Design a protein around this nucleic acid. Structure first.
Length: 1093
DNA sequence: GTCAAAAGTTGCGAAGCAAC
């Protein structure tokens, strides 16, 4: 079969043969249904170039009566030129092989019998053919691979994952908190070796259109396509389509010996015709294209498995959710596109980015940051217009072309739109391509339609709409429209009248908006002006939306989902800050914030921090050095952060802002040190930025004083700015030269020796490593520690207990799964080493890996909720195989063999379950529930709704919230841990693993002497803890359901969901309600106790 | 120990350790 297709490849298609064995024929087979149209083609490049030569030929090739109308004259011309470039890449590959065969006589040794086709660096030899005294590439395989490379080169960058600080930390091996400014930026734009080859190889294999032999070693089924990809990347480096940069980590800190390769694809002109249709090759080669836009009723297919978790199938309910979201039609909002176009890329960067950089009128590290910002915006802008260019081809009126987006379920249950820059992920794109739309009657400002319009405009303009009633926000909005924004509104009225903008459009927008500036704010100015010049106000069509947005969503979800003790009055008061109102029929968040409690969860946490800080000050009331250090940290923060304020007489004011990120990531399992690093980071960014201000402050007046050049605005007078500068220098000095240390359970100050001082140079000023670390230690002990105490005090110690038990159970289970998998692999390999047809380098077959995974099912690797599936340990790492998979023909680009297998979970269990059974379950329900809202854009913890359906959609969202609050993630974990506990055998664990388990199940002093029996006993203890927690959560949810509740967690609109519970708890204090609820709790405890018969 | 996906390069010589 396959031999008939590739009859001339070198070697025998029999793993038993004694001579050269061809592992390409042994590893792959032809599918029972064609996947690639090039299979059988003698000259794929020639044949595909032919297909791309005219619309008529493309239609014949793809056996379709119609071709994407974007495939026009100019596009066809570009693809003809791109095909000629494919011949160049093909030519470079041919010379590289010849060079490889000539070097150290590999070709001669291979012809003589040496099995070089089994070397990790010679796997490509499996796709060559004898040619006279040498070997040559099989043209069909080589040319198809090139076609894969061309498509990859055109769209890979638009499908790369975004890299955050943590990612860069993992890659570079540098502490996330001590990363040098710009590093994350440099790494987020380029691709690591693994990233590049992996995506390239995946693409090559799909284009070869064959199927893997389940009984063939991974060293070939995966290694040959990877070997081909490595060569193609090498070819692209020679052609300059890709730039390789090897970043030496030692340059940043001499201990780090890692040299990391980065690959950046050369960008095509933003105006290149190819951008309007960058997927012609993919749609021509594949019978079922992956990359393509979905227009009209061309709908994306539904993914069968969870993203990057092959072993996890999307449940029926998750698939229904994905189908529902992919069904939604998005439409281009022409006015906004025209606005972006008129402004221009240069002015959008100036308005929403860093504008033009004068890399000498701003601090070096600041500039690196600004440059990072412009990039994100510029890339979003080019991406939107590439899409617009293809949409415009679909018809005369671009605003009528329906667009669909593909989604998939992530590891944590979130429905993620696929692609780097889309409406769900990119703010700029979000205001140009929308699914929201409504025709409103705005002829009378007393209409319900006009109220909705106002709500959308207000929210977009940064008015806190969920903190006040509709009537009150209407007045706030009116004030802004008739005041500060008035000049911008006039400019937009003129734009919507003549289509022209002033030369100072950026300045008018900037001044009018102030800190309200955002893309959605531009949409509000755009839409309000359009209504003003509107002909028929009785039927105003607008995509303006209102986002029903969760109020402290993650933290509140965790509180409802994992608090398992009796009800307390503090919890009742705090949970109300998240929209769960007890005994207050039809109460909304708007009313709550304006009449009952103006502090949300962030503020309450901050207020707890303040109290915990005072407590810390007392414990060291006599220690002047300690007090002075605390004063310096607050002084430094008050100097650059807006959320920290210090009055004239010393009064400390802390705004909810400082607790936002910290509370959020604390619910995602973050440690205290990470929070400290981020807090320091925001401080330093402000400093670097202040330095830049000086540079220009002095360029304007070479006589301006340093004090006034650095604090000239933030102060009242000169002697006043002079004392601000005194605070700065002193603070930086004490915070970098002295750090707090935990000795004997007490705080003691230590000299670092690496103090910071000297005449500052606002051009090169840079807080070094040791100094950022000193700053971090001070931040940790004098600010983050008490913040953590306040947070715990706010969300409840019961919740913290649950999350720790959850973390322990899932870590323990992940450690076992990881170790057992590794062991079964070593056992199998040892067994293969006795097989003569097998060789080291080859690995296990896919079937063998499958068997090993299956042997772990009794340890319950998956957590099931009944509508979602979570696999916490699931991952892909190079540690299982611990070997190279393939290299390029120059012996470089050595791609490690990565394998899908369980790995230690760390704290991931908390985020997985919180995010998954919280917002993830809620959105899933909202997409599939009876009367599920249509035409919305869901963004995990918020949903954009069209102005015509804000009331019902918001109510449905709140009902969806209530539905997810019926979940019990701890019970789900318990049922998994329970099966695991009865089948596990800790004795079969490596000492390395057993130790990790002891850290989770025993208290630090019991680890050293801990016997298998000891940890095994402790592990079973955790199981009982989980059972008891699950039982309480379950009871609480049933009890709460009997009471009258009003839920408005997805706030803004003021349409709370009523559970209509019968037990009336109105006219009762939180203490009274807690007592009544606990009575119901105890009642059920007895009922579900002895009587369930 | 923040989730969303992983994660160093290269000579010698043909695996996998040494040097950076």
């Amino acid at each position: 079969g396959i031999d008939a297709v590739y009859p001339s490849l070198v070697g025998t298609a029999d793993s038993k043969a004694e001579g050269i064995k061809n592992y390409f024929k042994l590893s792959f087979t032809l599918p029972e249904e064609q996947k690639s149209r090039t299979v059988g083609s003698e000259a794929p490049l020639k044949d595909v170039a032919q297909a791309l030569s005219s619309r008529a030929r493309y239609e014949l090739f793809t056996e379709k009566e119609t071709a994407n109308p974007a495939f026009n004259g100019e596009v066809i011309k570009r693809y003809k030129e791109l095909m000629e470039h494919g011949e160049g890449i093909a030519d470079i590959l041919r010379s590289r092989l010849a060079k490889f065969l000539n070097t150290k006589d590999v070709g001669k040794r291979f012809a003589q019998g040496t099995e070089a086709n089994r070397w990790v660096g010679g796997k490509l030899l499996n796709i060559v053919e004898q040619d006279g005294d040498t070997f040559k590439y099989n043209e069909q395989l080589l040319q198809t691979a090139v076609l894969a490379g061309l498509q990859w080169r055109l769209t890979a960058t638009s499908n790369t994952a975004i890299k955050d600080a943590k990612d860069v930390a993992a890659i570079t091996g540098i502490d996330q908190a001590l990363l040098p400014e710009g590093l994350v930026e440099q790494f987020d734009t380029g691709m690591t070796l693994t990233e590049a080859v992996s995506s390239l190889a995946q693409k090559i294999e799909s284009y070869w259109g064959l199927s893997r032999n389940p009984n063939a070693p991974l060293g070939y089924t995966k290694g040959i396509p990877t070997a081909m990809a490595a060569e193609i990347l090498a070819a692209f480096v020679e052609s300059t389509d890709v730039v390789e940069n090897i970043v030496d980590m030692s340059e940043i800190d001499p201990d780090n010996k890692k040299t990391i390769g980065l690959y950046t694809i050369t960008e095509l002109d933003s105006f290149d015709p190819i951008n309007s249709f960058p997927t012609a090759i993919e749609e021509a080669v594949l019978v079922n294209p992956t990359e393509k836009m979905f227009f009209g009723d061309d709908i994306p297919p539904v993914a069968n498995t969870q993203l990057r978790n092959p072993a996890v199938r999307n449940t029926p309910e998750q698939k229904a959710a994905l189908k529902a979201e992919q069904a939604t039609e998005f439409y281009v909002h022409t006015p906004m596109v025209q606005f972006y176009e008129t402004l221009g890329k240069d002015r959008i960067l100036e308005l929403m980015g860093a504008g033009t950089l004068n890399k000498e009128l701003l601090n070096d590290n600041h500039a690196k940051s600004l440059e990072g910002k412009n990039r994100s915006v510029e890339d979003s802008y080019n991406q939107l217009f590439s899409v617009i260019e293809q949409v415009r081809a679909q018809s005369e009126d671009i605003s009528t072309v329906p667009i669909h987006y593909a989604y998939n379920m992530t590891r944590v249950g979130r429905m993620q739109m696929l692609g780097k820059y889309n409406p769900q992920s990119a703010k700029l794109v979000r205001e140009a391509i929308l699914p929201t739309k409504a025709t409103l009657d705005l002829s009378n400002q007393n209409n319900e339609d006009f109220s909705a319009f106002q709500l959308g405009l207000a929210q977009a303009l940064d008015i806190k709409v969920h903190t006040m009633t509709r009537e009150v926000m209407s007045d706030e909005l009116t004030k802004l429209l008739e005041g500060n924004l008035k000049p911008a509104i006039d400019m937009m009225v003129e734009f919507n009248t003549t289509g022209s903008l002033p030369e100072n459009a950026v300045d008018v927008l900037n001044t009018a908006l102030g800190d309200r500036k955002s893309f959605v704010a531009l949409m509000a100015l755009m839409e309000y002006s359009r209504y003003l010049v509107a002909e028929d106000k009785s039927a105003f069509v607008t995509p303006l939306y209102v986002e029903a947005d969760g109020v402290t969503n993650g933290p509140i979800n965790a509180m409802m989902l994992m608090t398992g003790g009796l009800f307390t009055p503090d919890w009742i008061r705090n949970i109300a800050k998240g929209g769960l109102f007890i005994g207050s029929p039809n109460k909304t968040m708007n009313e709550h914030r304006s009449t009952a409690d103006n502090n949300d969860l962030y503020q309450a946490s901050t207020n707890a921090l303040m109290e915990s800080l005072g407590k810390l000050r007392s414990n060291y009331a006599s220690n002047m050095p300690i007090q002075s250090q605390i004063d310096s940290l607050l002084s430094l923060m008050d100097l650059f952060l807006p959320d920290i304020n210090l009055g004239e007489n010393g009064a400390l004011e802390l705004k909810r802002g400082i607790a936002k990120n910290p509370l959020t990531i604390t619910i995602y399992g973050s440690g205290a040190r990470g929070i400290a690093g981020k807090l320091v980071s925001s401080v330093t960014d402000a400093i670097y930025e202040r330095m830049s201000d000086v540079l220009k402050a002095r360029a304007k007046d070479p006589n301006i004083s340093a004090a006034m050049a650095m604090f000239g605005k933030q102060a009242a007078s000169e002697a006043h700015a002079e004392e601000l500068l005194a605070r700065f220098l002193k603070d930086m000095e004490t915070l970098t030269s002295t750090v707090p240390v935990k000795r004997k359970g007490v705080l003691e100050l230590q000299s670092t020796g690496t103090g910071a001082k000297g005449k500052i140079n606002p051009k090169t000023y840079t807080i070094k490593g040791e100094q950022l670390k000193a700053l971090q230690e001070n931040m940790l002990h004098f600010f983050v520690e008490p913040l953590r105490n306040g947070i715990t005090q706010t969300v409840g110690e019961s919740l913290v207990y649950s999350t720790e038990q959850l973390q322990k159970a899932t870590q323990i289970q992940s450690v076992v799964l990881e170790d057992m998998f590794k062991q079964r692999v070593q056992e199998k390999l040892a067994e293969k080493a006795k097989d003569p047809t097998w060789k080291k380098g080859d690995f296990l077959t896919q079937k063998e890996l499958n068997d090993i995974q299956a042997s772990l099912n009794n340890l319950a690797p998956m957590i099931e909720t009944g509508s979602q599936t979570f696999y916490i340990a699931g991952s892909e790492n190079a540690e299982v195989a611990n070997q190279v998979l393939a290299t390029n023909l120059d012996d470089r680009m050595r791609v490690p063999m990565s394998i899908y297998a369980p790995a230690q979970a760390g704290v991931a269990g908390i985020p997985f379950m919180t995010i998954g059974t919280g917002d993830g379950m809620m959105m899933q329900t909202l997409s599939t529930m009876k009367g599920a809202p249509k035409n919305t854009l869901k963004i995990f913890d918020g949903m954009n709704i069209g102005l015509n359906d804000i009331t019902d959609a918001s109510r449905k969202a709140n009902e969806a919230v209530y539905t997810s609050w019926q979940g019990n993630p701890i019970k789900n974990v318990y049922e998994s841990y329970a099966k695991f506990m009865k089948n596990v055998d800790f004795s079969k664990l490596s000492p390395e693993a057993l130790e990790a388990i002891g850290k989770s199940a025993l208290e630090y002093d019991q680890r050293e002497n801990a016997t298998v029996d000891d940890i095994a006993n402790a592990a079973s203890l955790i199981e009982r803890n989980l059972r008891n927690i699950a039982l309480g959560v379950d009871i609480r949810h049933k009890v709460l359901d009997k009471v009258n509740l009003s839920i408005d967690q997805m706030a803004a609109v003021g349409a709370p969901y009523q559970n209509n519970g019968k037990i009336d708890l109105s006219n009762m204090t939180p203490e009274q309600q807690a007592d009544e609820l606990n009575k119901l709790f105890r009642e059920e405890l007895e009922a579900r106790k002895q009587k369930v018969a």
